[PDB]
Amino acid sequence: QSATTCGSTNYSASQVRAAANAACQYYQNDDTAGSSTYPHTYNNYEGFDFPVDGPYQEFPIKSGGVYTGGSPGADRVVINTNCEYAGAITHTGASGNNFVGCSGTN
Numbered sequence: 001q002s003a004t005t006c007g008s009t010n011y012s013a014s015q016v017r018a019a020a021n022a023a024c025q026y027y028q029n030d031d032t033a034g035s036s037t038y039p040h041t042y043n044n045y046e047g048f049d050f051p052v053d054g055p056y057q058e059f060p061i062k063s064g065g066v067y068t069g070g071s072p073g074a075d076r077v078v079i080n081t082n083c084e085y086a087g088a089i090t091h092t093g094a095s096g097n098n099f100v101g102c103s104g105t106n
């Protein structure tokens with residue numbers, strides 16, 4: 001994971017790692033954060049060309065710390081089931097429940 005910009009939000013490489021890291025941890029323990037359903041399967045309905053193969057899991061990323069439950073916000077980190085970083089996606093600039101890539105994800 002590297003620095004990225006989702007809509008207007010700038011996430012540092014450390015912030016992306018921490019989120020990616022958390023998603024992995026929970027995926028591994030067959031856990032979810034708080035009372036949410038994250039991390040959960042990310043189907044890739046949008047056809048992003050991730051640098052790693054799937055299956056994938058999505059997890060929120062946000063400023064101010066690692067997601068713990070509640071509103072996930074617009075941003076997400078995507079990892080595969082091998083805990084390999086796939087990319088960052090966002091609802092910002094998208095329509096409906098669609099996602100668009102954050103900088104570096106296409």
Ligand SMILES: Nc1nc2c(ncn2[C@@H]2O[C@H](CO)[C@@H](O)[C@H]2OP(=O)(O)O)c(=O)[nH]1
Nearest residue numbers: 040041042043044045046058076097098099
């Ligand atoms: N748009 C979209 N939704 C997905 C995908 N994979 C799973 N979903 C989920 O299917 C619904 C459509 O947006 C939501 O519940 C969404 O999860 P999240 O809202 O947790 O991101 C995907 O690749 N794209």
